[model samples]
Target: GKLYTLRYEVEGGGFIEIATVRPETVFADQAIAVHPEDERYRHLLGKRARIPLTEVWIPILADPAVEKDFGTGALKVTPAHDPLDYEIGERHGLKPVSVINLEGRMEGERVPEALRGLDRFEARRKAVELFREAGHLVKEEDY
Candidate 1:
């Protein structure tokens, strides 16, 4: 309900919501970019993050698979999880978030304990399942 720790952005102007479960990747944000093919935000490629999350004003990138039908046409490039994100981060000389441990849980030593000691994928499943149960999941796909 409140933000007393820190504030950051995943992409251009999207501020990191306080209630968001993704905080482990806060420090590793390298850019707030979009798909170069997407005419909507194509101009943002190689730009800088509008919202200042960390001291670094990372670059913006545009890729092909930033599906407009997906969650958002502009995806946050997190190299630690998605391969494209990693490649994009590398292309821009950005670093990946090391907050997740080998167990898939947030690295407690570096991350918060509330998200520790759990399988990352399992945690993702649980988180989404809970969201679905709580009517937070927007929709589910058949395939």
Candidate 2:
């Protein structure tokens, strides 16, 4: 799997990096999730990150269900795209936002204008490229 990153400036002026395996689902993300006991990010609870390409802010909350040993020790919470994420959303009362239409393209109103109508796979690459170009991307990795 390819890791796509989204780097956001934390309140203390440091950067908190979140790597996502499905960049396309970013359009549907309602928040970011980290383990409450993970010291690496415990200080960041209740903070927020601005989504790349879109100016929306998503809460950086805690959930023990998150695997702290995983990539970046954070998750881009796209409840509409993943079943596990849906459960997490329900717990946090985060709403699901879907960007994919019946054609499997990013056609939802929540998607950025430039990204609308792009296929899921294409959206993945484009989303990562945009994050990288804007200096929001930290690095790419495969696992």
Candidate 3:
């Protein structure tokens, strides 16, 4: 369950870091979440995080489900391709956007044209590359 921790340079603000093992779902990301009692991110609860490599900005939600000490006290809410995440989206009334198709290729309106039709693993690398290029890639750890 190794993953990359990223730095989301918030628009008109500061950084909101997140980590994910499935970088392929980066495009499907709909929101950012932190524990309701997490004072570290309380101020960012309602702010928007500019999703790396995408023109869209995602919401920052305060949810009790988040474990404050887990992975920078931040979590990316990608409703699609994740059942547990779908629950969060459902609670927040977020629209689910699926990027990985049945063929395991990234295919969605939210996905950039350059990444469309690419294999998930390749998409993962490419996504991380985009984040790195954007100066958002913090670190990738393998264990």
Candidate 4:
């Protein structure tokens, strides 16, 4: 029920902006999805994007399910958090990683140790600060 514009740096030192309602789920994002025909991101298709505040590199996939006009035409694929995303990841043969542990703590292998053992909401707050510190957060607005 909310949205925030997040700008993450790509592998070659470029930025791709994404607007999402849940920045907290970012740690679980396995890839970036854009519409197959969206010209704005066509060059990024088959490329990789570096996940902000983490060492993960995710592919930029051209998926028909992505809406060309929604949220900068880019979608963060968080399969572990969303069912629809789970299906998309499955279709792409991506392994979903859970950043939020069963105990509601951030302790996944891919999650940074500095963020481990924190509550999900607490992780969200910390992640926002980290994004800002890294100059990755583009902007925040009410949706």
- Pick by lDDT: which candidate is best? 3
Worst 10 residues of 2 by lDDT: 4-13
Report the Cα lDDT for candidate 4: 0.84
TM-scores of the candidates in the order shown: 0.50, 0.90, 0.93, 0.92
Give me the displacement of residue 73 in model 4, in angstroms: 1.1
Candidate 1 runs further than 4 Å off: 1-32, 42-60, 63-72, 108-113, 129-137
- What TM-score does prediction 1 earn? 0.50
TM-score of 3: 0.93
**lDDT agreement of model 3 with the native:** 0.86
lDDT of each: 0.50, 0.83, 0.86, 0.84
TM-score winner, 2 or 4: 4
Model 1 residue pairs with clashes: 34-62, 35-62, 35-63, 36-62, 36-63, 104-120
Best by TM-score: 3
Better model by lDDT: candidate 1 vs candidate 2: 2
Please give the ranking of all candidate structures by TM-score, highest first, separated by commas: 3, 4, 2, 1
lDDT tens readout by residue for model 3, 1-143: 56799988776778988988887788889999899888888888788998777789999998889888778889999887788789999999989989998988999877877789999889888887877887888998997
By lDDT: ranked, best first? 3, 4, 2, 1
Q: Kindly list the per-residue Cα lDDT of model 2 for residues 77-123, writing each as its tens digit.
A: 88888999999999999988888877888877668777899898898
